[PDB]
Amino acid sequence: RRKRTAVTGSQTALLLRAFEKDRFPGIAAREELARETGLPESRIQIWFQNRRARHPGQ
């Protein structure tokens, strides 16, 4: 178990917008999102994975 990352409302909103542009960001795009959101890139990867599995689109 790693410590569960607290994702804020504003962070979620920014991730949802990037998801609309590309559902499979590569590591460079994820590192950009990491810098923009404050989340570690590793956590952005997991966020996108879960999003794809649970709420694709909309």
mmCIF file of N, CA and C in Angstrom:
data_model
loop_
_atom_site.group_PDB
_atom_site.id
_atom_site.type_symbol
_atom_site.label_atom_id
_atom_site.label_comp_id
_atom_site.label_asym_id
_atom_site.label_seq_id
_atom_site.Cartn_x
_atom_site.Cartn_y
_atom_site.Cartn_z
ATOM 1 N N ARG A 1 0.817 -1.206 0.000
ATOM 2 C CA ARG A 1 0.000 0.000 0.000
ATOM 3 C C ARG A 1 0.854 1.261 0.000
ATOM 4 N N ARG A 2 0.582 2.170 -0.935
ATOM 5 C CA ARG A 2 1.157 3.506 -0.888
ATOM 6 C C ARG A 2 0.106 4.395 -0.235
ATOM 7 N N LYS A 3 0.528 5.569 0.230
ATOM 8 C CA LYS A 3 -0.399 6.475 0.900
ATOM 9 C C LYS A 3 -1.393 6.996 -0.142
ATOM 10 N N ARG A 4 -2.690 6.992 0.179
ATOM 11 C CA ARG A 4 -3.670 7.329 -0.847
ATOM 12 C C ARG A 4 -3.559 8.811 -1.166
ATOM 13 N N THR A 5 -3.282 9.122 -2.428
ATOM 14 C CA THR A 5 -3.118 10.507 -2.853
ATOM 15 C C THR A 5 -4.453 11.231 -2.785
ATOM 16 N N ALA A 6 -4.465 12.379 -2.120
ATOM 17 C CA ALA A 6 -5.647 13.219 -2.049
ATOM 18 C C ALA A 6 -5.696 14.065 -3.309
ATOM 19 N N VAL A 7 -6.705 13.846 -4.141
ATOM 20 C CA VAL A 7 -6.873 14.594 -5.380
ATOM 21 C C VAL A 7 -7.953 15.631 -5.133
ATOM 22 N N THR A 8 -7.631 16.904 -5.332
ATOM 23 C CA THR A 8 -8.580 17.961 -5.045
ATOM 24 C C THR A 8 -9.600 18.119 -6.182
ATOM 25 N N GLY A 9 -10.660 18.866 -5.879
ATOM 26 C CA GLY A 9 -11.648 19.186 -6.895
ATOM 27 C C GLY A 9 -11.035 19.839 -8.111
ATOM 28 N N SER A 10 -10.188 20.839 -7.892
ATOM 29 C CA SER A 10 -9.545 21.522 -9.013
ATOM 30 C C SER A 10 -8.620 20.582 -9.786
ATOM 31 N N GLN A 11 -7.913 19.697 -9.078
ATOM 32 C CA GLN A 11 -7.079 18.721 -9.769
ATOM 33 C C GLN A 11 -7.926 17.785 -10.629
ATOM 34 N N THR A 12 -9.024 17.276 -10.073
ATOM 35 C CA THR A 12 -9.936 16.439 -10.851
ATOM 36 C C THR A 12 -10.409 17.145 -12.125
ATOM 37 N N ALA A 13 -10.843 18.402 -11.982
ATOM 38 C CA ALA A 13 -11.322 19.165 -13.131
ATOM 39 C C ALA A 13 -10.268 19.284 -14.226
ATOM 40 N N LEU A 14 -9.030 19.586 -13.840
ATOM 41 C CA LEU A 14 -7.962 19.667 -14.820
ATOM 42 C C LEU A 14 -7.691 18.311 -15.461
ATOM 43 N N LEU A 15 -7.720 17.209 -14.681
ATOM 44 C CA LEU A 15 -7.536 15.883 -15.285
ATOM 45 C C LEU A 15 -8.680 15.536 -16.251
ATOM 46 N N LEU A 16 -9.918 15.889 -15.903
ATOM 47 C CA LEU A 16 -11.047 15.621 -16.803
ATOM 48 C C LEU A 16 -10.879 16.360 -18.143
ATOM 49 N N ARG A 17 -10.331 17.573 -18.128
ATOM 50 C CA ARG A 17 -10.141 18.286 -19.391
ATOM 51 C C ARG A 17 -9.068 17.623 -20.250
ATOM 52 N N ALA A 18 -7.966 17.194 -19.632
ATOM 53 C CA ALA A 18 -6.920 16.514 -20.390
ATOM 54 C C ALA A 18 -7.415 15.186 -20.946
ATOM 55 N N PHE A 19 -8.275 14.491 -20.193
ATOM 56 C CA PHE A 19 -8.862 13.230 -20.636
ATOM 57 C C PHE A 19 -9.636 13.413 -21.935
ATOM 58 N N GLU A 20 -10.402 14.494 -22.029
ATOM 59 C CA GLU A 20 -11.098 14.831 -23.264
ATOM 60 C C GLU A 20 -10.148 14.986 -24.445
ATOM 61 N N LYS A 21 -8.938 15.487 -24.221
ATOM 62 C CA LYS A 21 -8.044 15.697 -25.348
ATOM 63 C C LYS A 21 -7.317 14.419 -25.753
ATOM 64 N N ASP A 22 -7.030 13.536 -24.798
ATOM 65 C CA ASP A 22 -6.246 12.327 -25.035
ATOM 66 C C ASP A 22 -6.426 11.387 -23.837
ATOM 67 N N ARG A 23 -6.987 10.206 -24.069
ATOM 68 C CA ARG A 23 -7.237 9.260 -22.993
ATOM 69 C C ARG A 23 -6.026 8.398 -22.676
ATOM 70 N N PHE A 24 -4.996 8.422 -23.532
ATOM 71 C CA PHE A 24 -3.775 7.637 -23.323
ATOM 72 C C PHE A 24 -2.564 8.551 -23.411
ATOM 73 N N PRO A 25 -2.477 9.535 -22.514
ATOM 74 C CA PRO A 25 -1.284 10.394 -22.477
ATOM 75 C C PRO A 25 -0.037 9.556 -22.266
ATOM 76 N N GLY A 26 1.000 9.840 -23.054
ATOM 77 C CA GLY A 26 2.308 9.276 -22.802
ATOM 78 C C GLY A 26 2.966 9.942 -21.605
ATOM 79 N N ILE A 27 4.146 9.431 -21.252
ATOM 80 C CA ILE A 27 4.820 9.899 -20.043
ATOM 81 C C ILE A 27 5.155 11.390 -20.113
ATOM 82 N N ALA A 28 5.486 11.909 -21.297
ATOM 83 C CA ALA A 28 5.837 13.323 -21.377
ATOM 84 C C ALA A 28 4.609 14.197 -21.136
ATOM 85 N N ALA A 29 3.467 13.805 -21.699
ATOM 86 C CA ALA A 29 2.235 14.543 -21.473
ATOM 87 C C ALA A 29 1.774 14.401 -20.031
ATOM 88 N N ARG A 30 2.025 13.252 -19.431
ATOM 89 C CA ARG A 30 1.658 13.057 -18.038
ATOM 90 C C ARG A 30 2.544 13.894 -17.140
ATOM 91 N N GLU A 31 3.841 14.006 -17.488
ATOM 92 C CA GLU A 31 4.743 14.838 -16.697
ATOM 93 C C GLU A 31 4.348 16.302 -16.795
ATOM 94 N N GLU A 32 3.907 16.738 -17.971
ATOM 95 C CA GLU A 32 3.330 18.073 -18.082
ATOM 96 C C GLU A 32 2.137 18.242 -17.146
ATOM 97 N N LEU A 33 1.173 17.315 -17.211
ATOM 98 C CA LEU A 33 0.044 17.357 -16.297
ATOM 99 C C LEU A 33 0.515 17.309 -14.852
ATOM 100 N N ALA A 34 1.532 16.491 -14.553
ATOM 101 C CA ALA A 34 2.095 16.476 -13.194
ATOM 102 C C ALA A 34 2.493 17.884 -12.751
ATOM 103 N N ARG A 35 3.271 18.571 -13.589
ATOM 104 C CA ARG A 35 3.682 19.937 -13.264
ATOM 105 C C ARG A 35 2.480 20.863 -13.093
ATOM 106 N N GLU A 36 1.479 20.740 -13.972
ATOM 107 C CA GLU A 36 0.321 21.626 -13.937
ATOM 108 C C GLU A 36 -0.556 21.376 -12.716
ATOM 109 N N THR A 37 -0.727 20.117 -12.323
ATOM 110 C CA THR A 37 -1.725 19.792 -11.315
ATOM 111 C C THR A 37 -1.135 19.727 -9.913
ATOM 112 N N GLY A 38 0.187 19.470 -9.800
ATOM 113 C CA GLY A 38 0.785 19.162 -8.525
ATOM 114 C C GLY A 38 0.800 17.696 -8.160
ATOM 115 N N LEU A 39 0.169 16.841 -8.943
ATOM 116 C CA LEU A 39 0.177 15.412 -8.665
ATOM 117 C C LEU A 39 1.440 14.764 -9.223
ATOM 118 N N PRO A 40 1.955 13.727 -8.576
ATOM 119 C CA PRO A 40 3.067 12.979 -9.182
ATOM 120 C C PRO A 40 2.597 12.281 -10.447
ATOM 121 N N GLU A 41 3.468 12.252 -11.452
ATOM 122 C CA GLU A 41 3.139 11.567 -12.694
ATOM 123 C C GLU A 41 2.625 10.146 -12.457
ATOM 124 N N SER A 42 3.232 9.401 -11.533
ATOM 125 C CA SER A 42 2.754 8.041 -11.275
ATOM 126 C C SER A 42 1.275 8.041 -10.894
ATOM 127 N N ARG A 43 0.835 9.058 -10.194
ATOM 128 C CA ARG A 43 -0.553 9.125 -9.780
ATOM 129 C C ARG A 43 -1.469 9.507 -10.942
ATOM 130 N N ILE A 44 -0.983 10.360 -11.842
ATOM 131 C CA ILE A 44 -1.750 10.680 -13.033
ATOM 132 C C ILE A 44 -1.961 9.429 -13.884
ATOM 133 N N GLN A 45 -0.933 8.588 -14.034
ATOM 134 C CA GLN A 45 -1.117 7.355 -14.790
ATOM 135 C C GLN A 45 -2.267 6.518 -14.225
ATOM 136 N N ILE A 46 -2.262 6.318 -12.900
ATOM 137 C CA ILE A 46 -3.328 5.535 -12.264
ATOM 138 C C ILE A 46 -4.683 6.212 -12.468
ATOM 139 N N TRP A 47 -4.731 7.546 -12.345
ATOM 140 C CA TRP A 47 -6.002 8.256 -12.514
ATOM 141 C C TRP A 47 -6.594 7.966 -13.894
ATOM 142 N N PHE A 48 -5.762 8.052 -14.938
ATOM 143 C CA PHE A 48 -6.257 7.811 -16.293
ATOM 144 C C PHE A 48 -6.697 6.364 -16.481
ATOM 145 N N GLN A 49 -5.903 5.430 -15.966
ATOM 146 C CA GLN A 49 -6.278 4.010 -15.997
ATOM 147 C C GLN A 49 -7.681 3.820 -15.436
ATOM 148 N N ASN A 50 -7.904 4.333 -14.230
ATOM 149 C CA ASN A 50 -9.185 4.124 -13.581
ATOM 150 C C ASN A 50 -10.310 4.796 -14.355
ATOM 151 N N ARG A 51 -10.027 5.979 -14.885
ATOM 152 C CA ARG A 51 -11.019 6.694 -15.637
ATOM 153 C C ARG A 51 -11.398 5.898 -16.861
ATOM 154 N N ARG A 52 -10.408 5.318 -17.537
ATOM 155 C CA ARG A 52 -10.747 4.575 -18.740
ATOM 156 C C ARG A 52 -11.658 3.407 -18.406
ATOM 157 N N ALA A 53 -11.375 2.750 -17.286
ATOM 158 C CA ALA A 53 -12.118 1.569 -16.873
ATOM 159 C C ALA A 53 -13.520 1.895 -16.400
ATOM 160 N N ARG A 54 -13.726 3.071 -15.813
ATOM 161 C CA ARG A 54 -14.932 3.372 -15.057
ATOM 162 C C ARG A 54 -15.845 4.392 -15.725
ATOM 163 N N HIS A 55 -15.309 5.401 -16.412
ATOM 164 C CA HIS A 55 -16.136 6.482 -16.971
ATOM 165 C C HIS A 55 -15.502 6.984 -18.245
ATOM 166 N N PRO A 56 -15.453 6.159 -19.289
ATOM 167 C CA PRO A 56 -14.934 6.637 -20.570
ATOM 168 C C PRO A 56 -15.873 7.681 -21.179
ATOM 169 N N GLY A 57 -15.327 8.855 -21.477
ATOM 170 C CA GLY A 57 -16.105 9.931 -22.073
ATOM 171 C C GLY A 57 -17.056 10.584 -21.085
ATOM 172 N N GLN A 58 -17.801 11.566 -21.595
ATOM 173 C CA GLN A 58 -18.729 12.366 -20.789
ATOM 174 C C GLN A 58 -18.029 12.977 -19.582
#
